[PDB]
């Protein structure tokens, strides 16, 4: 065994709570997809890539959640008044591997609305993507020791967090350096985004440490709840904020659909 | 066990009836989605978000119903002339957790067609959303006692209903204060909407009390029927009324597609 | 047991035929959906709702058929050279409950192309919908006696048929009263539609009586065949006729896309 | 048993090959669907129905293949180094019944680009559809004797082939009579289409005779391969040719999107 | 047995890793689909077919991955602390047969943006397609010997690689001959594409040889990882590069949406 989810038994209540969270996640992401498609038409072409990137992230994350959700119900059966493992195992590594695609998308959509262009765009994009792959690959290896070797967990943890800090650094640099060039009064909004990011992105490394400070079924419940809030904050709500920033700037630049959409 | 659905056995007739209601719910929500997409083009951009919000709700609700309906058939087997539970359990908590996303959407689409703007929009939105999360979270906890502790059910019930009343109060304030500014003769229509809301939204707390006044398989049938009607009324039919209000006001404001759509 | 489907065993040929019919139904409805979407652009806005209503009916009916089809293969297994029931039951009540949504849609799309407007539209709509819910609810109750009490079947049958007759009466009134105002030479076409309706809608009450005049597996084969033809006629082919009528009248009213679509 | 697929056992290689063919078929048809949607916009409205008809056929055929593919894996299990039948049966009749809808669509899209209009269109359409229903229904009955009575197979074979010949005759008449009126140099292209048709459509009656000249698991492999090629040829590649002919004639008629699409 | 996947048992970690890779692949392909649809509108009509070809490839490859991923979890069960085969077998042949459709699409989208036209287009298309079918069919036969006869593997390998070399030769000819006529400074970009192709396309023949140099569960892990990277590189990232080249050349040709999309 590799994940502590597979070590425990669950009460009907615990088991059903986790099923409730995973099922809700799936539908929020597919629903947000339809919304991004319908309002994409009010964004000026120069910023429409930012909205297209949200559609990518919604579909990708939605499909992973849908897998986790099926796996949860398939791995366990109710037998003698508790849910117990049965012939399949449950892991979180699905998420980790999926971040290899979605974290780039989240970061690129911020650079686009910050109005970076050309060399500066492509350069920052490259550094952010490699830092992120760095963070994710070392995280994935780490979480392979959550049952066996908590020492190893924390070691790879620390390396992973190195890359995190670099990435957060670059992002904040660019934000605070470019906030002033922002149109339509979105300098205020972009700052709220950066906060949202800091909160939501932090929940993930907390979830990564639950094995270390809560190795039991209540820990398991907590980790699944943290992942759920972090996904809805870091992907859906952040996507709504990026899109709203893009429509505001579109209108300021005199794109009429945007201007109409706002009155 | 946490829900009374899991306590009973069911006649083929009862069991099949409930599967018929759940199956129909799924398809009404996905069907209404196609309609909202096709007629969105007759709504002026200033109101198109209201229609997009219906698309979110139809997809989210549709996918939950689809889960409930699969779980129902999976949790039970026909064995000695009745349907009996088998190795999985059935709960309604799927709905509860999903309301955390859909009730905001329903409330925001009413504000948009009431023509609130700016500070007043954002302020009312915030208070309505927190009231709603309040109502939902305390309801979810409550319904965890429906088998064990009916006292606790009613206590958390009462708190939940507090938040309800605040929310209904704010909504009615805004409606009756802004009915006069409504274009295209939609002051009449908006009043019908507010009624629809009052009826449909009330079915939910009735369904929540069935354990208290009908703890048996006929109760279970009733609760599933109440949920079905309340979902079709509170989401699909209310969505059709909001969209019709939006087309009426679009045309009054001189949006041509809207004017054509009406003749 | 409520339905005679669940009383019999089936030869591989009978069993496979029924699976062939159900599977085909599913794909005809989803296919027709894409067609209605593509040609909706040639309908003038005044009539586009008629085409949108066909999309609703295609998705809703398609998803019911898809359920029936999975249930069929899940309820039975091949055991000693025949298909026999196993641990789940099969019913038709899925269809009945779904008519509560689709029959309104079918009736509304006829009124729209008949060019009814305002009070007359909303009034006729209301009477037709209540008649239809009347017919469907009493039919659903009826078919709960198909195994036990054929007397009761015929009694509720007769009530259901009352509502039918009212509904057919109103429809024909409106058709024959408004045929003359029809544009683009669609007075001829609308009459064909009314015939199609009469044939296709009648198959349903015949299928409802098979228990009474053929209580065996060949009856069961017949009922499934009748439902298949009646669904393709009453929904898909009638949809194609309504849309063709709408494009003809669009062109007559001088909508260019319609005129182009016809040359 | 009705089909010889259900009579044999299969090597892993045979069994896997057939699963490979069925799975690929499904995706080619759903992929071609997206292509027909995206390029439909370069076809003039007078010919856009021809492209819409391809979308119908892609969805319908894709969903049947998807069923066959699931049935294949469900009907057999690997047991003592071979795949053997288990509690479900496998048939081809799914395809037969589906031709009742798709063969009309294929034939109507050819008449549209041949530029037939009005009476001549509706008349030819009617004769071709009834011939085709004739061919398909007699084929279906035929193939019910593939295990029992090869005499009966060939008798119904012969009748089926009667209707074939009529249908091929009418089609060739129309093609060779109308080739000269065709725009944009598509007289060459339309002749290629007619050849493609002759080849692809012939594979079907060959597949129908395999029981007679190869009653074994290698026959079964051959029949599935013949069906796969014939489906890709008769639906996807023919669809791409009809669409290309329609864009060429659109441009010749001075539809600008078509002219742009070609340069 | 035909594939070495079916010969081994797997640790939870090995087994889970492979399920993580397969699951991610599915969602990247369906996600990239939505992106290609949204940005297709910024490509001039003359090049829009190149983008439509990416949509085909994303759906086709997505659906294959989705099958492989279900088969993997269905073929194995966790039993005595390892994953072991159970009653179904696992193969890679699904991919091979799917290349018969996707490799043509990949090659055709490169010719379109290289600006080949008419005779030269249709001629090169034909040679490249037959070369590719040659490479694929001989590969498929080869991989039927991976368990039994590694000699035969390498023989058919060698023939397959013949066709590879021809195909790479033609592609490079055309690229380096037409790089100079490329608009918008895409001569640089097209060269990067050709490199991408060389790397990504080569992984496949390496994966084909793993049986020869790593016949064990770690080899199996390697092959699945190689296929995952090769699919993301050869289809998704290459598609993003083709579409970017198409937007650049569209803008240079004075298509306004393209010019807007770039500023
Ligand atoms: C399903 C949800 C439940 C799961 C739990 C989720 C955790 C909660 C996350 C914290 C919420 C943080 C809210 C940040 C909003 C910032 C305010 C603001 O300035 O907005 C930005 C800007 C405005 O900021 P500003 O700086 O311009 O201020 C402007 C104020 N006026 C105009 C009055 C002068 O506007 C936006 O629209 C941003 C997007 C709106 C935020 C979306 C709603 C958030 C919560 C709603 C419910 C969530 C579920 C619905 C999802 C369904 C979609 C498919
Ligand atoms: C996608 C699914 C299709 C619908 C599924 C249900 C079938 C239809 C149900 C009833 C009709 C639909 C509601 C009307 C739509 C909105 C009308 C509109 O555009 O404007 C409002 C119109 C306009 O009103 P007004 O104020 O402008 O005045 C009337 C209009 N003039 C002046 C032109 C005559 O108002 C109404 O018609 C009020 C609608 C109230 C409907 C109440 C129904 C609630 C209870 C139903 C429970 C059933 C649920 C379970 C079973 C259902 C089957 C699935
Ligand atoms: C949707 C996904 C694609 C799936 C198929 C992928 C494989 C590609 C092979 C065929 C595709 C190309 C055919 C359509 C060409 C577009 C039409 C066009 O523009 O004009 C036609 C052209 C036009 O001819 P013309 O008469 O206008 O003159 C030539 C045109 N100029 C002058 C401009 C050069 O005609 C042809 O090229 C005929 C092509 C048809 C022959 C098809 C052979 C295949 C037969 C079946 C065997 C293969 C099936 C099994 C393999 C499995 C595949 C997955
Ligand atoms: C990534 C998903 C899962 C993890 C698996 C890892 C992927 C496989 C590893 C190999 C990656 C190879 C990268 C080569 C691409 C770089 C070449 C390039 O772009 O050249 C510059 C070229 C242009 O080069 P140029 O020649 O014009 O010069 C530079 C241009 N100016 C001057 C304007 C700055 O850019 C493009 O072509 C633009 C779009 C292509 C770039 C997109 C690739 C993203 C790579 C990371 C993937 C992240 C998410 C992927 C999934 C998305 C989901 C839909
Ligand atoms: C913890 C609880 C906090 C959460 C509550 C936050 C407030 C709610 C949001 C405000 C309402 C709003 O966004 O409406 C939509 C606003 C319109 O408003 P406006 O044009 O600014 O109005 C001022 C009007 N003038 C200028 C005439 C004065 O944007 C738009 O049309 C753009 C559409 C895309 C933006 C995405 C919106 C996301 C909504 C989906 C959430 C489920
Ligand atoms: C027991 C329950 C009874 C309730 C029955 C109500 C009947 C429905 C009313 C007609 C609606 C219609 O189809 O079209 C409604 C309108 C046509 O309005 P009009 O009055 O002709 O406008 C002309 C006004 N004059 C007469 C003064 C000149 O078109 C539209 O573009 C409106 C957009 C559609 C909004 C969503 C409603 C469609 C729901 C359909 C799914 C069931
Ligand atoms: C098989 C799936 C059917 C899909 C086609 C029908 C949908 C109609 C949608 C309208 C689109 C449109 O614009 O239609 C228009 C087109 C073109 O006809 P037209 O313009 O009148 O001809 C020219 C008229 N002049 C001469 C006055 C200019 O009509 C069609 O294509 C209809 C195809 C024929 C129908 C076949 C009926 C035979 C059935 C026999 C049963 C045994
Ligand atoms: C895998 C194939 C699927 C996709 C192809 C389907 C095309 C149909 C839609 C037309 C859209 C359009 O406009 O196509 C545009 C382009 C061609 O026209 P052009 O270069 O713009 O101008 C023409 C140049 N002149 C104006 C100067 C004369 O056509 C193609 O690409 C042609 C198809 C590719 C070659 C066929 C493959 C070889 C077959 C042999 C295999 C045994
Ligand atoms: C990663 C998933 C999706 C990435 C997007 C793919 C592009 C395809 C569509 C282009 C549409 C368009 O028009 O693109 C336009 C913009 C660029 O032009 P601009 O911003 O207007 O600047 C205007 C100034 N110029 C004219 C000088 C450029 O391109 C992008 O932003 C592409 C994203 C670049 C980041 C790539 C990172 C490389 C990763 C390497 C790590 C190993
Ligand atoms: C939608 C997904 C998002 C935004 C995911 C973000 C994930 C992280 C920021 C992960 C952080 C981690 C560390 C910094 C150390 C521990 C391991 C990780 C990878 C979970
Ligand atoms: C589509 C979903 C809708 C509109 C749901 C509405 C939900 C409620 C009005 C729930 C209300 C409750 C109470 C007021 C008390 C008991 C607990 C609740 C949560 C059922
Ligand atoms: C697509 C569905 C349609 C058009 C359904 C039509 C159904 C009927 C007209 C049903 C009629 C019935 C009677 C008149 C008597 C017996 C009971 C019914 C409900 C089957
Ligand atoms: C995509 C489906 C197509 C083009 C279907 C074609 C089917 C046939 C031409 C079937 C023909 C038959 C005969 C000529 C004789 C034997 C029976 C049939 C039905 C196989
Ligand atoms: C999306 C899929 C792509 C680009 C597939 C490419 C496949 C190949 C280049 C396969 C090549 C092979 C050889 C050159 C030798 C061994 C056998 C093959 C078929 C794997
Ligand atoms: C033990 C017998 C081995 C398997 C039997 C079938 C033989 C497979 C070889 C056929 C050639 C490959 C075809 C690949 C392209 C697919 C056609 C659409
Ligand atoms: C008996 C054990 C049950 C443990 C679960 C109870 C959790 C109650 C919190 C309700 C949170 C609902 C909102 C979900 C957040 C997205
Ligand atoms: C496969 C990913 C492994 C990690 C690759 C290391 C690069 C990440 C750090 C990049 C930081 C450079 C920023 C310099 C410009 C501010
Ligand atoms: C014997 C079990 C109870 C059967 C219930 C019979 C009443 C029939 C209800 C009417 C048909 C469906 C109403 C659907 C409302 C959306
Ligand atoms: C062993 C007896 C089975 C009974 C099946 C024979 C039916 C004859 C074929 C009917 C043709 C199918 C087309 C129907 C699609 C609407
Ligand atoms: C395409 C993205 C690849 C994701 C990279 C994840 C890191 C993989 C390292 C560990 C592999 C696990 C082997 C089995 C463990 C016993
Ligand atoms: Cl722009
Ligand atoms: Cl993710
Ligand atoms: Cl507006
Ligand atoms: Cl909900
Ligand atoms: Cl109009
Ligand atoms: Cl129905
Ligand atoms: Cl036209
Ligand atoms: Cl077919
Ligand atoms: Cl162009
Ligand atoms: Cl592939």
PDB file of N, CA and C and ligand atoms in Angstrom, chain D residues 29 57 60-62 64-65 94-103 204 231 234-235, ligand 28:
ATOM      1  N   UNK D  29     -15.997   7.365 -36.392  1.00  0.00           N
ATOM      2  CA  UNK D  29     -17.284   7.995 -36.644  1.00  0.00           C
ATOM      3  C   UNK D  29     -17.492   9.217 -35.754  1.00  0.00           C
ATOM      4  N   UNK D  57     -25.617  10.445 -39.836  1.00  0.00           N
ATOM      5  CA  UNK D  57     -25.092   9.113 -40.018  1.00  0.00           C
ATOM      6  C   UNK D  57     -23.895   8.905 -39.087  1.00  0.00           C
ATOM      7  N   UNK D  60     -25.384   8.135 -35.421  1.00  0.00           N
ATOM      8  CA  UNK D  60     -26.113   6.889 -35.392  1.00  0.00           C
ATOM      9  C   UNK D  60     -25.168   5.674 -35.481  1.00  0.00           C
ATOM     10  N   UNK D  61     -24.357   5.609 -36.516  1.00  0.00           N
ATOM     11  CA  UNK D  61     -23.398   4.550 -36.693  1.00  0.00           C
ATOM     12  C   UNK D  61     -22.398   4.507 -35.548  1.00  0.00           C
ATOM     13  N   UNK D  62     -21.865   5.634 -35.140  1.00  0.00           N
ATOM     14  CA  UNK D  62     -20.947   5.581 -33.994  1.00  0.00           C
ATOM     15  C   UNK D  62     -21.580   4.887 -32.776  1.00  0.00           C
ATOM     16  N   UNK D  64     -24.053   2.668 -32.561  1.00  0.00           N
ATOM     17  CA  UNK D  64     -24.222   1.239 -32.756  1.00  0.00           C
ATOM     18  C   UNK D  64     -22.864   0.568 -32.567  1.00  0.00           C
ATOM     19  N   UNK D  65     -21.837   1.041 -33.227  1.00  0.00           N
ATOM     20  CA  UNK D  65     -20.556   0.415 -33.024  1.00  0.00           C
ATOM     21  C   UNK D  65     -20.212   0.410 -31.549  1.00  0.00           C
ATOM     22  N   UNK D  94     -27.956  -5.691 -34.732  1.00  0.00           N
ATOM     23  CA  UNK D  94     -27.834  -4.264 -34.432  1.00  0.00           C
ATOM     24  C   UNK D  94     -27.582  -3.449 -35.699  1.00  0.00           C
ATOM     25  N   UNK D  95     -26.642  -3.877 -36.542  1.00  0.00           N
ATOM     26  CA  UNK D  95     -26.348  -3.119 -37.739  1.00  0.00           C
ATOM     27  C   UNK D  95     -27.566  -3.089 -38.662  1.00  0.00           C
ATOM     28  N   UNK D  96     -28.161  -4.236 -38.892  1.00  0.00           N
ATOM     29  CA  UNK D  96     -29.248  -4.321 -39.836  1.00  0.00           C
ATOM     30  C   UNK D  96     -30.293  -3.280 -39.475  1.00  0.00           C
ATOM     31  N   UNK D  97     -30.734  -3.286 -38.228  1.00  0.00           N
ATOM     32  CA  UNK D  97     -31.836  -2.420 -37.847  1.00  0.00           C
ATOM     33  C   UNK D  97     -31.418  -0.962 -37.997  1.00  0.00           C
ATOM     34  N   UNK D  98     -30.155  -0.663 -37.696  1.00  0.00           N
ATOM     35  CA  UNK D  98     -29.686   0.694 -37.871  1.00  0.00           C
ATOM     36  C   UNK D  98     -29.667   1.214 -39.327  1.00  0.00           C
ATOM     37  N   UNK D  99     -29.322   0.386 -40.320  1.00  0.00           N
ATOM     38  CA  UNK D  99     -29.508   0.739 -41.729  1.00  0.00           C
ATOM     39  C   UNK D  99     -30.909   1.267 -42.072  1.00  0.00           C
ATOM     40  N   UNK D 100     -31.960   0.894 -41.361  1.00  0.00           N
ATOM     41  CA  UNK D 100     -33.262   1.448 -41.696  1.00  0.00           C
ATOM     42  C   UNK D 100     -33.252   2.963 -41.649  1.00  0.00           C
ATOM     43  N   UNK D 101     -32.374   3.542 -40.815  1.00  0.00           N
ATOM     44  CA  UNK D 101     -32.281   5.002 -40.726  1.00  0.00           C
ATOM     45  C   UNK D 101     -31.106   5.554 -41.559  1.00  0.00           C
ATOM     46  N   UNK D 102     -29.962   4.885 -41.575  1.00  0.00           N
ATOM     47  CA  UNK D 102     -28.801   5.495 -42.184  1.00  0.00           C
ATOM     48  C   UNK D 102     -28.808   5.380 -43.701  1.00  0.00           C
ATOM     49  N   UNK D 103     -29.326   4.299 -44.309  1.00  0.00           N
ATOM     50  CA  UNK D 103     -29.257   4.190 -45.771  1.00  0.00           C
ATOM     51  C   UNK D 103     -30.056   5.317 -46.441  1.00  0.00           C
ATOM     52  N   UNK D 204     -21.048  -5.548 -48.074  1.00  0.00           N
ATOM     53  CA  UNK D 204     -22.049  -5.990 -47.137  1.00  0.00           C
ATOM     54  C   UNK D 204     -22.578  -7.368 -47.524  1.00  0.00           C
ATOM     55  N   UNK D 231     -17.940   0.099 -43.372  1.00  0.00           N
ATOM     56  CA  UNK D 231     -18.500   1.233 -42.642  1.00  0.00           C
ATOM     57  C   UNK D 231     -17.657   2.487 -42.848  1.00  0.00           C
ATOM     58  N   UNK D 234     -18.269   3.407 -46.693  1.00  0.00           N
ATOM     59  CA  UNK D 234     -19.591   3.802 -47.128  1.00  0.00           C
ATOM     60  C   UNK D 234     -20.102   5.014 -46.349  1.00  0.00           C
ATOM     61  N   UNK D 235     -19.487   5.367 -45.211  1.00  0.00           N
ATOM     62  CA  UNK D 235     -20.067   6.448 -44.427  1.00  0.00           C
ATOM     63  C   UNK D 235     -19.075   7.596 -44.292  1.00  0.00           C
TER      64      UNK D 235
HETATM   65 CL1  LIG F  28     -25.368   1.720 -39.412  1.00  0.00          CL
END
